[PDB]
Amino acid sequence: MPTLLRVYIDGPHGMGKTTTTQLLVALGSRDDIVYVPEPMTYWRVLGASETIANIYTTQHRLDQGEISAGDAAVVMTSAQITMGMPYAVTDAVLAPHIGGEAPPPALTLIFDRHPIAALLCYPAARYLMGSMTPQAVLAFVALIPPTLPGTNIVLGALPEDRHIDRLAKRQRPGERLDLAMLAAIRRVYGLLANTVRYLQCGGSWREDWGQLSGPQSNAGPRPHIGDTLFTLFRAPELLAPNGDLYNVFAWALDVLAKRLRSMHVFILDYDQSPAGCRDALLQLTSGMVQTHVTTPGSIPTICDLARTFAREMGE
Amino acid sequence: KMPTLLRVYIDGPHGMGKTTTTQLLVALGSRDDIVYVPEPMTYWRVLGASETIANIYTTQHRLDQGEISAGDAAVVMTSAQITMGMPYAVTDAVLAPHIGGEAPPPALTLIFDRHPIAALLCYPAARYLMGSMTPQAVLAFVALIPPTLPGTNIVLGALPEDRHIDRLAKRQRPGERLDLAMLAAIRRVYGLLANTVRYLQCGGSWREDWGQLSGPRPHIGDTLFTLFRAPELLAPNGDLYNVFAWALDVLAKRLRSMHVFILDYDQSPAGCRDALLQLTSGMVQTHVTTPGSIPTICDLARTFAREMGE
Numbered sequence A: 001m002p003t004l005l006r007v008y009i010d011g012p013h014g015m016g017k018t019t020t021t022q023l024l025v026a027l028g029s030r031d032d033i034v035y036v037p038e039p040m041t042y043w044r045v046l047g048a049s050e051t052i053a054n055i056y057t058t059q060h061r062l063d064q065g066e067i068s069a070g071d072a073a074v075v076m077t078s079a080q081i082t083m084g085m086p087y088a089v090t091d092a093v094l095a096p097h098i099g100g101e102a103p104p105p106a107l108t109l110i111f112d113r114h115p116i117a118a119l120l121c122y123p124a125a126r127y128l129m130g131s132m133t134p135q136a137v138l139a140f141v142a143l144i145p146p147t148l149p150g151t152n153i154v155l156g157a158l159p160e161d162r163h164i165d166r167l168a169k170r171q172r173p174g175e176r177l178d179l180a181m182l183a184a185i186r187r188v189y190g191l192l193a194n195t196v197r198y199l200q201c202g203g204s205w206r207e208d209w210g211q212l213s214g215p216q217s218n219a220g221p222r223p224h225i226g227d228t229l230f231t232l233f234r235a236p237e238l239l240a241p242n243g244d245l246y247n248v249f250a251w252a253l254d255v256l257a258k259r260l261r262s263m264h265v266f267i268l269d270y271d272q273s274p275a276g277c278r279d280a281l282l283q284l285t286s287g288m289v290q291t292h293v294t295t296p297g298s299i300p301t302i303c304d305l306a307r308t309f310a311r312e313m314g315e
Numbered sequence B: 001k002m003p004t005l006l007r008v009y010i011d012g013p014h015g016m017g018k019t020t021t022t023q024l025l026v027a028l029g030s031r032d033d034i035v036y037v038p039e040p041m042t043y044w045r046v047l048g049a050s051e052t053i054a055n056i057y058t059t060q061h062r063l064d065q066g067e068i069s070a071g072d073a074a075v076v077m078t079s080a081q082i083t084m085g086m087p088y089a090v091t092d093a094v095l096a097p098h099i100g101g102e103a104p105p106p107a108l109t110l111i112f113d114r115h116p117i118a119a120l121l122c123y124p125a126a127r128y129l130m131g132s133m134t135p136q137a138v139l140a141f142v143a144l145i146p147p148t149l150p151g152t153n154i155v156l157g158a159l160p161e162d163r164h165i166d167r168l169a170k171r172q173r174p175g176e177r178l179d180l181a182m183l184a185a186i187r188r189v190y191g192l193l194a195n196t197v198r199y200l201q202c203g204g205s206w207r208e209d210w211g212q213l214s215g216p217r218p219h220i221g222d223t224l225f226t227l228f229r230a231p232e233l234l235a236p237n238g239d240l241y242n243v244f245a246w247a248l249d250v251l252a253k254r255l256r257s258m259h260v261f262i263l264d265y266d267q268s269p270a271g272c273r274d275a276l277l278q279l280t281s282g283m284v285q286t287h288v289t290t291p292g293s294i295p296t297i298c299d300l301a302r303t304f305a306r307e308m309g310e
């Protein structure tokens, strides 16, 4: 069976994700590589009206105390569902075409983001910003789809100073320049990388839970649990009077561990020119995991899906 | 070589049984070879959020009274439905690795109060019909329905509407309001659900029959697909956007492999209990995946019950 390389470009926004990605796709021909781009048309029109605007306006009104935490949370939670929808459907239709893990791939499929972006990372940051409850974050976590083999994810690294500068120059429609949110999202993605490494080094969150109080994967020693996503969830809302997590929330963390531990995570250094990033990413794809497809007709089906997606939801 | 499991999801529109109905189900769970995962009312009222059911019904009421907009109501219903479904989704996700292929009496029978689709598809679709949820949100929930594992036996209820109104009025839940429009909506959705499974199982192709919505199995107009001929979901030329069409493809895949069973609730609580046992002889069993799966399952269900059930 012909092979597939799937690569999800993810991480915080504002780093040069898109430019880098497009430059890589520009190196292929057409039958070689396809791009599933950012679904901005879904976000601005198809799913709801100006979802990014709504998110940033809501956080703003919260900060100013014009609306309550509960009011912000219902909006943020609903908004995140709309944000996540294209990633989620794409995963569900792709799933039956993906075979076991597997020399040049017949097809390279590059994604602008993975479902965890909208189900885990942005919600966890909004929780840090006080505009989402931890119960809602964990509900999203429980809904993360099963991790398909050959799930390669690229996260970004960039100094905070350079990040703040780059971000100010590429605000999206409706976006406001919230540096607290930038700090939150950078922190969440740092924790994410540590979490994957922690799990792959044999970390068991239940064993280390009691060590809690008060970045890179695919390399390095095992992180402390306090430096992983698990640390976010020792919140009073989630704790029984006897002090431990309610089991329902503990089960969500079990799901978080299962989903992340089989992912192949890489870190791209964005602190360089657009061409530099492209070639960095290219080099990085050499150590990435390919899968077989399920049928021989899977390949063109996949190209059709990607192009259809791009035409309808891409800018 | 692995032990066998029978999973049974008791679902359908709420308010059809009797309070003495569930006791027998708890009673049935009294055996060591049957566990009964109960309704997670404590999660809804306290753990996930405060009085989620009250929040839901008050919101519809205020919308009905003109005190809030359709948009205001939608964001509330959407985020509330996340809270409602969380216990089902976490449970499904931790159970998933333990379920093998299809398979005498089973080593263990697991009876759930509701399946994930109740909170991801059915109540959301009913709220869409009540004008308090966008169809895009409903299809986003649909897209997140976990893959249908082998042996997914869903029990749906049959009860004439008037008798249903009677029973429902006599056991309102905390924060609930007796809304006849919602009863009709939720009854309609579940009816369409049952039709939708038969449609799919008889080889119905929604993409093939789609045009019939504007011009031996149910007519597509009598399936859930008819709800998503919603104008929000269509391009200026009337075509369904592909993103929503893919969500319908998912809907089809999830629903087709479910095994539906109809339980007549128009009888005594003991009669209902007996009927449920009668139904089990046709339900699909599976192997589990490890020798430790069975006790792990019992533990999950008992812990769920103790923590989140009443």
Ligand SMILES: Cc1c(/C=C(/CO)CF)n(C)c(=O)[nH]c1=O
Binding pocket: A012, A013, A014, A038, A052, A055, A080, A083, A084, A113, A117, A118, A119, A122, A172
């Ligand atoms: C994916 C995602 C994003 C990221 C975007 C582009 O990276 C959209 F602005 N943002 C900014 C959110 O607020 N929530 C999300 O789920």
Ligand SMILES: Cc1c(/C=C(/CO)CF)n(C)c(=O)[nH]c1=O
Binding pocket: B014, B015, B039, B053, B056, B081, B084, B085, B114, B118, B119, B120, B123, B173
């Ligand atoms: C499962 C579910 C229910 C059903 C309940 C009892 O079956 C809670 F009252 N209700 C009433 C909703 O509004 N949403 C849901 O997701």
